Amino acid sequence: VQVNDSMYGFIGTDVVLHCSFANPLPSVKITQVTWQKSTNGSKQNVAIYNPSMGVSVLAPYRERVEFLRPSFTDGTIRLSRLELEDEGVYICEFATFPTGNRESQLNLTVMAKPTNWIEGTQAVLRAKKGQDDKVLVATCTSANGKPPSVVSWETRLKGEAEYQEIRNPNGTVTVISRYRLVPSREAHQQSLACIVNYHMDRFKESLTLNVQYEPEVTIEGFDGNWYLQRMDVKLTCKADANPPATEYHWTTLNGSLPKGVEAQNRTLFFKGPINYSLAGTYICEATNPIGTRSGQVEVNITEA
Amino acid sequence: NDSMYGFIGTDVVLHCSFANPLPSVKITQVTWQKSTNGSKQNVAIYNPSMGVSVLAPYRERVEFLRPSFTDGTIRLSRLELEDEGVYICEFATFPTGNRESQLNLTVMAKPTNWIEGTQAVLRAKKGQDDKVLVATCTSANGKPPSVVSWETRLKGEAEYQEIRNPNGTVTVISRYRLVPSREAHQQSLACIVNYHMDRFKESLTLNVQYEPEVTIEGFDGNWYLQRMDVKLTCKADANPPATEYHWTTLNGSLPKGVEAQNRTLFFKGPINYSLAGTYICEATNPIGTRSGQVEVNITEA
């Protein structure tokens, strides 16, 4: 807010801090050029150039700071292998005689690319008719970023995202987003993508939900013409269920399974000539670990 | 963390020295700058190899006491308000870099004090519930502000006003108001201003005009049958003084023969069992008229 000059560089990288003495006169003799850092209400010395005694660099900076082209007018330095603790205000001061000192300051901000990942829930997801609880389904994390990234979601699911930002000791910020929804049949196998944006980079990872649900039964095998005397036709029970259906049981809307119709393993075979007596509604009851549910087909018997 | 205070016009010494001069460490230059605030301007420089340099506008006001590898102490002369600020003294050294010390300079000003009463003619009057201005105490161009207060047995309201002037000083003005009364007359009113343990004091004496308050004296417990030659005297407390005195009784008439010469009421010679009664003097003044009474007893005793 007091400084008009700001530098930014990523952890690990080098930045060039500039300082020049604008308007040299024959009168002004430049006595010494001093870089200092302040975190604020410390000033501490960084590097010095004296035209007559040479260059000094103080620790911690002994291997990381060096003047580019030391001169009566130039005290530009390079700071290498940038570290988070390098953040601060850097002051460059030209000591001159008899004209006094001149200084210029700048801000150094150190940036860090975050580490991003999506991880799904470790629970099993059940669609139950009872619970209307919003359950955790995926977590997207952007850790150790600086400045903080922006997290968001891309999905067709109707759910709720919570956000949490944590300032770490080192000044980086971890962003966490939790996606919660109420598990339903329509949610199964739906894609859920986590998007993370940092200084215009774009991370994206996807999950596919796995939601358990009780069976949704349909019966296939009845075409238009189950005409009289026709033989060897059958119905198959299609149980849409997660996990898959374990047991099957056939029955009719007019009592138990008749003679001339026997059930094995989810297909109902009608052995022998067809007759009017077999017309009716046939039912299949499929069972999985979640529950039992049923489906039917109206079977009318033709004459062709 | 280090603060200096000096008065306008005086000289102050701003100390700077280098604690632990060390074999390695070569002092390159010594520099004073004044920061007013967020700005650093150069004040004086001492370079061992090149000498001393004082910069405008200080050439005639600043000098190093004893320039040296380790002492940069200066004297700032003829202090002015505009000298307030933070002074930084920096030792440039090699190869250890710069070492600096700061101090705050606060410039002080002793205020100028005085009191003045109203030009108005303070006049007591029944029914006037209104407080009127009677003295103004001023402590002008002080810094920091002084503290103004009154010392009187009057029971009035003092208001205070504090004005921050462009130059940074502060004028303090106190106005003392009261409802004018007979008792307030001739009472002293003293403003007192305390500045840095100095105590200034200046007094006024109120002049309040009032309608007369009448008293009648000359009366004696025992008054004979036939005592001689006996007087009553009407002392009227008034300001300005009463100019007219008129006598009467509570039953209208002045019993012959009682002669009135003003503000004395002589009875010749014989007294009797008449000469009963209430006696009244009516005093008048530019305010005023008002009266007093006496119950007069006479027996053989």
From Swiss-Prot, chain B:
Changing residue 41 to A: Does not affect interaction with herpes simplex virus 1/HHV-1 and herpes simplex virus 2/HHV-2 glycoprotein D. GO terms for biological process: axon guidance; cell adhesion; cell-cell adhesion; cochlea morphogenesis; desmosome organization; enamel mineralization; heterophilic cell-cell adhesion via plasma membrane cell adhesion molecules; homophilic cell adhesion via plasma membrane adhesion molecules. Disulfide bonds join 16-89, 137-191, 234-281. The keyword Glycoprotein applies. Changing residue 55 to A: Does not affect interaction with herpes simplex virus 1/HHV-1 and herpes simplex virus 2/HHV-2 glycoprotein D. It is a single-pass type I membrane protein. It is found in: Cell membrane; Cell junction, Adherens junction; Presynaptic cell membrane. Residues 1-106 form the Ig-like V-type domain. One of its GO terms (cellular component) is plasma membrane. Changing residue 42 to A: Decreased interaction with herpes simplex virus 1/HHV-1, herpes simplex virus 2/HHV-2 and pseudorabies virus glycoprotein D, leading to decreased cell fusion with the virus. (Microbial infection) Ubiquitinated by CBL following infection by herpes simplex virus 1/HHV-1 and association with HHV-1 envelope glycoprotein D, leading to its removal from cell surface. Keywords: Cell adhesion, Cell junction, Cell membrane, Cell projection, Disease variant, Disulfide bond, Ectodermal dysplasia, Glycoprotein, Host cell receptor for virus entry, Host-virus interaction, Immunoglobulin domain, Membrane, Phosphoprotein, Receptor, Repeat, Secreted, Signal, Synapse, Transmembrane, Transmembrane helix, Ubl conjugation. Residues 114-203, 212-299 form the Ig-like C2-type domain. Changing residue 98 to A: Does not affect interaction with herpes simplex virus 1/HHV-1 and herpes simplex virus 2/HHV-2 glycoprotein D. Impaired homophilic interaction in cis and cell adhsion activity. GO terms for molecular function: carbohydrate binding; cell adhesion mediator activity; cell adhesion molecule binding; coreceptor activity; identical protein binding; protein homodimerization activity; protein-containing complex binding; virion binding. Belongs to the nectin family. Cis- and trans-homodimer. Can form trans-heterodimers with NECTIN3 and with NECTIN4. Interaction between NECTIN1 and NECTIN3 on the pre- and postsynaptic sites, respectively, initiates the formation of puncta adherentia junctions between axons and dendrites. Interacts (via cytoplasmic domain) with AFDN (via PDZ domain); this interaction recruits NECTIN1 to cadherin-based adherens junctions and provides a connection with the actin cytoskeleton. Interacts with integrin alphaV/beta3. Interacts (via Ig-like C2-type domain 2) with FGFR1, FGFR2 and FGFR3. Cell adhesion molecule that promotes cell-cell contacts and plays important roles in the development of the nervous system. Acts by forming homophilic or heterophilic trans-dimers. Heterophilic interactions have been detected between NECTIN1 and NECTIN3 and between NECTIN1 and NECTIN4. Involved in axon guidance by promoting contacts between the commissural axons and the floor plate cells. Involved in synaptogegesis. Has some neurite outgrowth-promoting activity. (Microbial infection) Acts as a receptor for herpes simplex virus 1/HHV-1, herpes simplex virus 2/HHV-2, and pseudorabies virus/PRV. Constitutes the major receptor for herpes simplex virus 1/HHV-1 entry into host cells. It is linked to Ectodermal dysplasia, Margarita Island type: An autosomal recessive form of ectodermal dysplasia, a heterogeneous group of disorders due to abnormal development of two or more ectodermal structures. It is a syndrome characterized by the association of cleft lip/palate, ectodermal dysplasia (sparse short and dry scalp hair, sparse eyebrows and eyelashes), and partial syndactyly of the fingers and/or toes. Two thirds of the patients do not manifest oral cleft but present with abnormal teeth and nails. This is Nectin-1. It comes from Homo sapiens. The lineage of its organism: Eukaryota, Metazoa, Chordata, Craniata, Vertebrata. The gene is NECTIN1.
